[PDB]
């Protein structure tokens, strides 16, 4: 899926940095391997439909008293891994205290950056403890003109890919010469790298084949 190059499931590993003047979308495009859905997803396509490609620049988050290696059975690369540019921040072990952390990132380029994170709405209230500490979690973001607050939603669901818990991926846009801030202690799917739009192109849809000599 067009948004799959931003999270990078085990299928978009060559379009992490894809350079292009043209985009094609298919009936089997899936932005997700661990079930979920973006929030304001179609908006991102139209911008991405005309982005000319993305330059992955590393964001640089250092995880201390936890894991980063977070993995599940759906988003398999080789065995069981996760999205490429996303550290599934489990607790320290398999229930442990996920302490209160806070990270920030800054833009050093004349172009704006694409910032994507996600909440892990766990399938139960225990599976919210299985990967993070117990007690309520609030992941609130900050910017000079963006101020939000999410609460993970622990609740039963349909099983998609054998998993019932979900991951709702959000995004905002960081202007050149500014920052972003995350304060959290749970249910967080961290970003490793943030996209940078390359220029001008076009995305369409079709369900047919291509031709290059015309």
């Amino acid at each position: 899926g067009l948004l799959g190059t931003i999270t990078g499931p085990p299928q978009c590993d060559q379009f992490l940095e894809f350079s292009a003047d043209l985009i094609i979308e298919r009936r089997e495009g899936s932005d997700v391997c661990y079930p979920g859905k973006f929030v304001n997803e179609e908006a991102l396509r139209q911008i991405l439909r005309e982005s000319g490609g993305i330059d992955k620049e590393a964001m640089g988050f250092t995880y201390s008293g936890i894991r980063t290696n977070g993995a599940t059975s759906a988003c398999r690369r080789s065995g069981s891994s996760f999205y490429a540019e996303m550290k599934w921040l489990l607790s320290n072990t398999d229930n442990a205290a996920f302490p209160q952390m806070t990270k920030s990132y800054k833009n050093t380029r004349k172009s704006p950056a694409l910032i994507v994170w996600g909440i892990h709405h766990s399938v139960s209230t225990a599976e919210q403890t299985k990967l993070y500490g117990s007690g309520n979690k609030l992941v609130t973001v900050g910017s000079s003109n963006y101020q939000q607050s999410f609460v993970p939603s622990p609740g039963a669901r349909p099983q998609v890919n054998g998993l019932s818990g979900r991951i709702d991926f959000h995004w905002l846009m960081l202007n050149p010469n500014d920052t972003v801030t995350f304060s959290f202690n749970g249910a967080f799917i961290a970003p490793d790298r943030a996209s940078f739009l390359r220029g001008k192109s076009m995305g369409i849809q079709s369900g047919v084949q291509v031709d290059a000599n015309c």
């Epitope: 398999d94 229930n95 979690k137």
Partner: antibody, heavy 119, light 115 residues
Framework: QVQLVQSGGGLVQPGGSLRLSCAAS????????MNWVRQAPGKGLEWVSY????????YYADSVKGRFTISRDNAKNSLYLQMNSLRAEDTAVYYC????????????WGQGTLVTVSS | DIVMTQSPDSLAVSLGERATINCKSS????????????LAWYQQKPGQPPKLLIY???TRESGVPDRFSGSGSGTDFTLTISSLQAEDVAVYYC??????????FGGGTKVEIKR
């Protein structure tokens, strides 16, 4: 009833090696976190290593950094501890395990083994 | 890692004496958003493995009679055997299960009854 038992203890000589072993009874093995704790002769307790549910993660201590090797089995009900380059501070008797989890309870330790690194 | 201590090292307090064991910590063990203390009490007799005594700091484990009680919060606690008994001649430890792959116990303490 849940119960545990350790084995593989005796007399060894330092710079040598041993391979400890646990056995279980009365619970879904494959689903929990498993620890390891040793106690030197009349000393305090010490955490050695653990394995997560899927065995996908292991974390040791610094006294055994590169000297010990914890290992699991879920079909068989066994948790292992290979030892290598034994030293004399490694003289101890070994136990362990908890209940992880949040909520409710638990407990639970084994009966033990005499392991001395006296050549 | 979180380094732990107790006092007194050894107390010889007589039968029926409210024995008071004080125990400290370097780093805090009280999680924020659920407000719970990661502290346990155990009872080992030489050759025996530890037996569970108090958890959540202030929650007794079943099978433990009423004289046992855990108190305190944050970095300092205290076990008060309201009526010290002769069954209670054992070694008691504090333990943290805050950080994870390093559970630090203590220095201990024996409680031998006077006369």
């Amino acid at each position: 009833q849940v119960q545990l038992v350790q084995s593989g203890g005796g007399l060894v000589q330092p710079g040598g090696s041993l391979r400890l072993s646990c056995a279980a009874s009365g619970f879904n093995f494959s689903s929990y976190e498993m620890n390891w704790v040793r106690q030197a002769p009349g000393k305090g307790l010490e955490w050695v290593s653990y394995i997560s549910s899927s065995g996908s993660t292991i974390y040791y201590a610094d006294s055994v950094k590169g000297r010990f090797t914890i290992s699991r089995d879920n079909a068989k009900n066994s948790l292992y501890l290979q030892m290598n380059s034994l030293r004399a501070e490694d003289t101890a008797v070994y136990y362990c395990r908890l209940l992880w989890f949040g909520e409710l309870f638990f407990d639970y330790w084994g009966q033990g083994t005499l392991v001395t690194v006296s050549s | 890692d979180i380094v732990m201590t107790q006092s007194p090292d050894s107390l010889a307090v007589s039968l029926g004496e409210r024995a008071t064991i004080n125990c400290k910590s370097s780093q805090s063990v009280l999680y924020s958003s659920n407000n719970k203390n990661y502290l346990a009490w155990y009872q080992q007799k030489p050759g025996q493995p530890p037996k569970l005594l108090i958890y959540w700091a202030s929650t007794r484990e079943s099978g433990v009679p009423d004289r046992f009680s855990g108190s305190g919060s944050g970095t300092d606690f205290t076990l008060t055997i309201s009526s010290l008994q002769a069954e209670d001649v054992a070694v008691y430890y504090c333990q943290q299960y805050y950080s994870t792959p390093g559970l630090t116990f203590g220095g201990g303490t024996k409680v031998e009854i006077k006369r």
